[PDB]
Design a protein around this nucleic acid. Structure first.
Length: 53
DNA sequence: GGGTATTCGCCGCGTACCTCTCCTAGCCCGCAAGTATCCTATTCCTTGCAGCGGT
């Protein structure tokens, strides 16, 4: 759906490797991934959003 | 037959007052309260075989 907008969409779960999950968390805390779809991993206290609305 | 004896079972044994304790056993049925297996996250590590520098 968002294939024609400047919006970054990323997925986090156990499927994503341990090497890229940390990268995704760094990107999210930095404030560059505007959509983050995730399972219960999102509630593990290490998922810090820059500006959540 | 019957007069007698013997047994058996029923009935009976004071008044008034004070203190205290305790008045069915057990089953059932439904409440409800506390437990073994199934998926999606998590923290826990210990092996097997090929590259591979290096000489």
């Amino acid at each position: 759906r968002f294939a024609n907008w400047p919006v970054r969409i990323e997925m986090i779960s156990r499927f994503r490797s341990a090497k890229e999950q940390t990268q995704i968390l760094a990107e999210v805390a930095e404030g560059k991934i505007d959509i983050l779809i995730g399972t219960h991993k999102l509630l593990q206290s290490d998922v810090k959003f820059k500006d959540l609305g």
